[PDB]
Design a binder for this molecule. Structure first.
Ligand SMILES: CC(=O)N[C@@H]1[C@@H](O[C@@H]2O[C@@H](C)[C@@H](O)[C@@H](O)[C@@H]2O)[C@H](O[C@@H]2O[C@H](CO)[C@H](O)[C@H](O)[C@H]2O)[C@@H](CO)O[C@@H]1O
Ligand SMILES: CC(=O)N[C@@H]1[C@@H](O[C@@H]2O[C@@H](C)[C@@H](O)[C@@H](O)[C@@H]2O)[C@H](O[C@@H]2O[C@H](CO)[C@H](O)[C@H](O)[C@H]2O)[C@@H](CO)O[C@@H]1O
Ligand code: CL
Ligand code: CL
Ligand code: CL
Ligand code: CL
Ligand code: CL
Ligand code: CL
Ligand code: CL
Ligand code: CL
Ligand code: CL
Ligand code: CL
Ligand code: CL
Ligand code: CL
Ligand code: CL
Ligand code: CL
Ligand code: CL
Ligand code: CL
Ligand code: MG
Ligand code: MG
Lengths: 310, 310
């Protein structure tokens, strides 16, 4: 009897589910060549999170661990959950919220989080994580911080990391669609969230974009995700059973109260639209509108085209 | 017709409303000597945010602005909203999400956010904000970053700031209850969220704590808030009319499904309990329980004592 719904927050007050940033756009990208397989911001409509998705906004693209000394003044990190609870292999692709950008450098700022170590002095460690490096093994709970400052940190120091910015590899652009290689062999329990394949009926996947310090990106400083973090939190909170093959949403103007565009959101946890031919689809719509659940529909419900013709 | 409710997320997956951190405790402190007047994490039960409270998790304790040169190689900042929209004086105490810690230094990490300035190079600016400094004027839209690195940033650079850590002033401890002096004279529209006074009936205010890099604090690295950010977002989303003088909550074990403790949440947006005499009140309860709305009650409903006797 719990009926389905989406948060009725304006798009531009909701946040990305792959970096901790405001959403400021939605886009389509039909003719781009990458698999769609983000591990963060993945949640079914009845509230089952997939991949490494956490419900917690403050865990999105964070990681935590304890220091040990690796060769050549590199800083090894034994991962834990951001909560401090232990992380064990063979159960998920990586700890909850663990960043899912594999195509470039993570410039990280960390702080000590042990209260006894926070009575005095600078608690910051900065450095650079290279997910394409051969010592990147997040599924088994270990990674390396290159070029740390301070360059010597006592073994066993508990550190909470944020990604201050992302950057391209040398002579490439940073593609924010590329997920990391989590390493190992994932058990069936620890499987990646599946890849999303393009839906039929002239539909294309809608991405919720944030401006983010992703330097040298293929997108010009924009990080895409499939669901606002508030959508993830809403579905986990609600646990509304799936009662149709897709959910029709209207994107409503808050001023005029009128329908700006039709969208479908699929049980697997992704949004589509039909772009008006020869235009940017939903990208030209105002960003202060609100998504509203209309009804369940079947997969073959035909959406009215959204956006302008160019 | 819209009935009241609280998010049914476990305490330890929700987040602070004054810093972007997981909640990991709830405490009482009936005897601490400060006024209770946070400006973030303030929301009525029918969903009106107060002070500088934003609904957006990724705006909590952030600020944004454009650089100008101040005397003695200080970095002046003309504030904007985190969304980039202009901030005008005389309407709120400070921009939405603006940090509300007045008793110590804010060690900040900023990045450029203009996409054209993110095609290449290091976008980071770090420095220190001193809210007790005479050039701290957030209501009128301006503040100063002391000791910036780089020490010269082009005028007009758009910067998004996070607080990496907080620290005590010299020869003092950092009290996280103290809010900034926002300056000026606040118009009636721009008024601070009111102070909360101790309730009757043996009740005391419940604080939701996070471990946070607050160095040299009176709390030993713990930041208190009145409401989890998810509660704020829930009330704004729901807009459930107030239908009683207080809302009785139970804090339910997710395993045994039994009631761990009775709490009241008041229309003004704060939680209370009655601590069992001579103990820490709710602090000893497991942090993985879930708050559930029982009913509206009057102010004189008498809560069963929570916690152990010591
Ligand atoms: C041992 C010593 O004096 N070290 C100082 C730093 O002071 C210590 O660390 C800070 C974080 C604070 O806890 C102080 O009480 C400690 O004694 C000093 O840090 C500055 O300290 C002032 C207050 O004394 C403010 O908190 C600043 O924000 C801190 O940066 C640094 C830099 O001056 O110098 C020595 O390491
Ligand atoms: C003009 C120049 O060569 N500057 C380099 C930096 O490279 C530029 O900035 C980075 C962020 C990237 O956009 C490069 O494509 C630019 O040319 C260099 O930064 C490192 O660059 C590598 C890739 O070249 C990675 O992105 C690293 O993560 C960056 O730190 C710095 C440090 O090596 O040196 C000069 O400033
Ligand atoms: Cl039904
Ligand atoms: Cl809805
Ligand atoms: Cl979670
Ligand atoms: Cl400790
Ligand atoms: Cl993998
Ligand atoms: Cl457009
Ligand atoms: Cl249909
Ligand atoms: Cl009624
Ligand atoms: Cl209802
Ligand atoms: Cl109503
Ligand atoms: Cl409830
Ligand atoms: Cl807001
Ligand atoms: Cl630009
Ligand atoms: Cl009443
Ligand atoms: Cl205790
Ligand atoms: Cl009563
Ligand atoms: Mg899992
Ligand atoms: Mg206001």
């Amino acid at each position: 009897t719990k009926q389905f719904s989406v948060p009725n927050l304006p798009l531009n007050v909701m946040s990305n589910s792959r970096v901790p940033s405001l959403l400021n756009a939605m886009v389509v990208s039909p003719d781009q060549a990458q698999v769609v397989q983000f591990q963060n911001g993945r949640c079914t409509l009845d509230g089952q999170m997939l991949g490494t998705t956490t419900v917690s906004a403050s865990c999105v693209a964070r990681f935590r661990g304890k220091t040990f000394q690796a060769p050549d003044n590199r800083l090894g990190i034994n991962l834990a959950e951001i909560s401090g609870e232990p992380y064990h292999a063979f159960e998920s692709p990586a700890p909850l919220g663990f960043p899912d950008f594999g195509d470039g450098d993570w410039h990280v700022t960390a702080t000590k989080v042990t209260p006894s170590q926070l009575e005095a002095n600078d608690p910051v460690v900065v450095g650079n994580v290279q997910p394409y490096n051969p010592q990147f093994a997040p599924h088994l709970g270990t990674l390396v911080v290159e070029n740390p400052t301070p360059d010597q940190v006592a073994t066993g120091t508990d550190l909470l990391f944020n990604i201050t910015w992302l950057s391209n590899r040398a002579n490439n652009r940073f593609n924010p669609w590329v997920i990391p290689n989590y390493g190992s062999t994932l058990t069936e329990a620890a499987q990646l969230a599946p890849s999303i394949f393009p839906p039929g009926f002239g539909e294309t996947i809608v991405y919720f974009n944030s401006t983010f310090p992703a330097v040298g990106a293929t997108t010009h400083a924009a990080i895409p995700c499939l669901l606002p973090q508030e959508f993830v939190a809403h579905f986990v909170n609600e646990q509304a059973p799936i009662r149709g093959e897709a959910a029709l949403l209207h994107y409503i103007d808050p001023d005029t109260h009128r329908n700006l565009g039709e969208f479908k959101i699929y049980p697997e946890g992704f949004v589509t639209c039909v772009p008006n031919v020869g235009g940017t689809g939903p990208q030209s719509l105002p960003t202060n509108g609100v998504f509203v659940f209309v009804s369940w529909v079947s997969r073959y419900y035909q959406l009215k085209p959204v956006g302008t013709a160019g």
